Design a binder for this molecule. Structure first.
Ligand SMILES: CC(=O)N[C@@H]1[C@@H](O[C@@H]2O[C@H](C(=O)O)[C@@H](O[C@@H]3O[C@H](CO)[C@H](OS(=O)(=O)O)[C@H](O[C@@H]4OC(C(=O)O)=C[C@H](O)[C@H]4O)[C@H]3NC(C)=O)[C@H](O)[C@H]2O)[C@@H](OS(=O)(=O)O)[C@@H](CO)O[C@H]1O
Ligand code: NA
Length: 754
């Protein structure tokens, strides 16, 4: 493994991270990318510490604070990037070069060297600095001496002697997993190019293989496409994207070389592009329900993370078979074209710009997001789509935490796992336009909530506690899904609620039952809490309009429906009062993240809710949401028994969709909902077509070995599709007995003939 091969690998990495070989002359998007590169470099140079015998490299960054030590090194690597990028203002500038070299030398002497013990966050010492210092060594290889390489390699190896492990010796070292394994292996691989160390490079490449093996618990990719990091938090949209980015860059770097990734099981990672990442991408944004504590970050948004996933997918597509390459390019062209709110080229790097330009040059057409249901039972998440909308549900259970907070981020997010209903629509900024700085964290859309105030960081950091609930889970057949959550409230209030969602191709029916608490406070259920930006969007009712005055809550008259201009319709399925509030809310990103700006953002909201009162005894609700419905269509929702409630109590919750001729149900106890029965916890959807009955079924606790259904629509004597055993009960009804051992909440599809 020789000098020529190492020089070629370093030159490829510099090509990848600068775009120096792919800048198109006179292209306006390249010029904008260089301007952004120039402005960041100039900002850093303006902050250089010029003092004799300096103790920092930048006047605004202390080397005694571990996060500011990381930013010292990322500024130095950005400066080296600019120095290596043709047409940048500092390209080849010897004075700027000397300042980068002196910054790397003094940061090494003063702080980050092979005699230093870690202080503070392990991630700073083992991932933040190594990736940036390794990039700077490679960018500056022709300029650093052999003695400088020896010093900086020794510092990296001191903190990361083995990238299969993490934490300083005093803590006890553990296996690194998922995004952390990828980031540690990346820093050692790039450091092995600077120091020409084939032994360390080979071991780091071999370390990538663990991250795409299927798991059934802990962190990683599950067979249903879920991705978990930190044991208990759904995490495809942030840690999953870190993993996707780092593998795309390392696979591209090493391809065709002596160090190429050759493990055939990497097919599992490729299958995750459509199995894991695509269903939670919504018009260019990663869904908030799968990005954990990053919702609290003003400048690490669902669109920032979706744009990074698009860049990685485009980079990986270059190596794939023709059909797969074109499918991934079509998905990306669609997420790019539909996103007029944060266009991907605004503030894009040179490499990102080149990949987006290459995609446009293929002429590959944009692929629409498919209607229908994508369920992720391993991480208590579901996605549902129809024309103009995508619903993301955020549940929690004895497997999945209420929320992750940590490092001063998302400390207020404790209700985000209480049955949230995110309706994404053509309002592309709904959840991005200062929503997380201004929203009422006690009235998030869809939740049931005990109004007892909870402290920041209630239930602990890092998802350490989970609700001891009965089950959360889901199933779907064709166009209809059934989703259930036994909500146990955070903060030991004793709040309990049975929340179910029955989701068709257009409307979502929301049923709640068995609601009580021990706290003595009122309990609410939030029909919506919806960002109006600076708008005065009209709320129309049967009688006229409601909540025309900001700050004055009103109760809906008798028609039972309300339409929100720019959104769609809501309607009540019982005779409970609906409270409607137009409100103006203010807050700063500093109020939800220690790193957030102090700038105050002010936003208008529409807030619709039911009040279960103090001391509810088996409190309940029933309502529906029709995203995109007109006033006329909203007025008609409650006519003709289109959405026919069957049962809504502590035993079962069920609705029939008249038009779709399909019935959906959740079961909490053994019992009957209309003419369907279950022997235990179940999600069921069924539809008869003439002499054939179709069923989807899940066993949502993930722990029962069997489940028996009492079948609707008459008697059934054979099985056409699927597995299960037919039987007959005491009352002459047909039964279906399923073996559910080890099914992990997955759906079984069955078809019976009369
Ligand atoms: C303090 C401590 O010991 N806590 C551990 C906890 O470790 C923490 O969790 C993560 C981790 O990597 O596991 C680490 O998260 C990453 O933090 C950095 C800054 O430190 C970035 O956050 S940001 O600066 O606020 O944006 C990073 O964000 C991502 O960065 C990048 C990138 O650099 O490539 C790209 C993405 O766009 C962006 O989202 C952030 N990662 C994410 C995805 O948020 C913390 O720094 C680290 O303290 C866990 O440790 S673990 O190893 O067991 O996982 C935790 C597990 O329960 O245990 C705590 O004790
Ligand atoms: Na956790």
């Amino acid at each position: 493994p020789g000098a020529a091969e190492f020089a070629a690998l370093r030159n490829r990495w510099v090509d990848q991270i600068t775009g120096r070989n792919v800048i198109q002359a006179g292209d306006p998007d390249f010029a904008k990318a260089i301007t952004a590169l120039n402005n960041k470099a100039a900002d850093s140079l303006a902050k250089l510490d010029a003092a004799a015998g300096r103790t920092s490299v930048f006047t605004d960054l202390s080397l005694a604070k571990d996060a500011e030590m990381v930013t010292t090194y990322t500024r130095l690597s950005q400066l080296a990037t600019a120095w290596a990028t043709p047409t940048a203002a500092v390209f080849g500038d010897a004075a700027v070069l000397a300042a980068i070299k002196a910054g790397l030398a003094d940061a090494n002497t003063l702080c980050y060297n092979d005699r230093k013990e870690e202080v503070g966050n392990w991630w700073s010492w083992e991932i933040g600095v190594p990736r940036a210092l390794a990039d700077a060594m490679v960018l500056l290889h022709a300029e650093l001496s052999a003695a400088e390489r020896t010093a900086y390699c020794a510092a990296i190896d001191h903190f990361v002697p083995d990238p299969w492990l993490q934490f300083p010796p005093k803590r006890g070292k553990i296996t690194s997993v998922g995004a952390n394994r990828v980031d540690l292996c990346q820093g050692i691989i790039i450091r092995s190019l600077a120091g020409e160390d084939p032994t360390k490079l080979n071991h780091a490449v071999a370390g990538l293989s663990q991250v795409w093996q299927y798991v059934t618990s802990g962190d990683g990719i599950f067979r249903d496409g879920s991705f978990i990091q930190h044991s208990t938090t759904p995490y495809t949209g942030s840690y999953g994207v870190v993993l996707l980015t780092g593998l795309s860059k390392l696979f591209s770097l090493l391809g065709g070389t002596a160090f190429e990734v050759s493990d055939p099981t990497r097919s599992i990672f490729f299958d995750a592009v459509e199995g894991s990442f695509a269903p939670v991408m919504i018009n260019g944004a990663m869904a908030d329900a799968v990005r954990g504590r990053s919702i609290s970050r003003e400048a690490n948004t669902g669109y920032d993370l979706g744009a990074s996933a698009i860049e990685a997918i485009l980079l990986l597509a270059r190596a794939m078979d023709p059909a797969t390459a074109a499918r991934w390019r079509g998905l990306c062209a669609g997420w790019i074209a539909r996103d007029t709110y944060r266009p991907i080229l605004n503030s894009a790097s040179v490499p990102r710009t080149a990949l987006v330009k290459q995609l446009e040059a293929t002429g590959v057409a944009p692929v629409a997001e498919a209607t229908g249901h994508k369920l992720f039972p391993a991480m208590d998440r579901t996605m549902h789509r129809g024309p103009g909308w995508a619903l993301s549900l955020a549940l929690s259970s004895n497997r999945i935490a209420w929320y992750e907070c940590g490092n001063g981020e998302n400390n207020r997010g404790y209700h985000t796992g209480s049955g949230m209903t995110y309706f994404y629509t053509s309002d592309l900024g709904q959840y991005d336009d200062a929503f997380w700085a201004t929203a009422n964290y006690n009235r998030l859309p869809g939740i049931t909530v005990d109004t007892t105030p909870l402290p920041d960081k209630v239930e602990g950091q890092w998802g350490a506690a989970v609700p001891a609930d009965e089950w959360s889970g889901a199933t779907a057949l064709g166009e209809v899904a059934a989703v259930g959550q036994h909500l146990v409230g955070p903060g030991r209030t004793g709040l309990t609620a049975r929340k179910s969602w029955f989701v068709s191709g257009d409307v979502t029916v929301c049923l709640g039952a068995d609601i009580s608490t021990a706290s003595g406070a009122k309990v609410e259920t939030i029909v919506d809490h919806r960002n109006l930006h600076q708008g005065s969007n009209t709320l129309t009712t049967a009688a006229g309009t409601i909540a025309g005055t900001a700050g004055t809550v009103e109760v809906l008259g008798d028609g039972r429906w309300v339409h929100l201009e720019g959104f769609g319709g809501y309607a009540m399925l019982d005779d409970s009062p609906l409270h409607v509030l137009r409100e103006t809310r203010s807050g700063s990103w500093s109020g939800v993240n220690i790193n957030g700006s102090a700038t105050v953002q002010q936003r208008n909201f529409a807030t619709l809710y039911v009040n279960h009162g103090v001391g509810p005894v088996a409190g309940s609700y029933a309502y529906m949401v029709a995203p995109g419905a007109s006033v006329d269509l909203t007025r008609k929702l409650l006519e003709g028994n289109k959405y026919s409630v069957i049962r809504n109590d502590a035993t079962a919750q069920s609705v029939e969709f008249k038009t779709a001729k399909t019935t959906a149900a959740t079961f909490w106890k053994p019992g009957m909902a209309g003419d369907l029965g279950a022997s235990g916890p179940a999600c069921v959807v069924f539809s008869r077509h003439g002499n054939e009955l179709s069923l989807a079924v899940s066993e949502p606790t993930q722990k029962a070995a069997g489940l028996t259904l009492t079948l609707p629509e008459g008697t059934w004597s054979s099985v056409l599709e699927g597995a299960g055993t037919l039987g007959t009960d005491a009352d002459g009804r047909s039964t279906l007995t399923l073996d559910t051992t080890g099914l992990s909440g997955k759906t079984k599809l069955i078809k019976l003939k009369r």
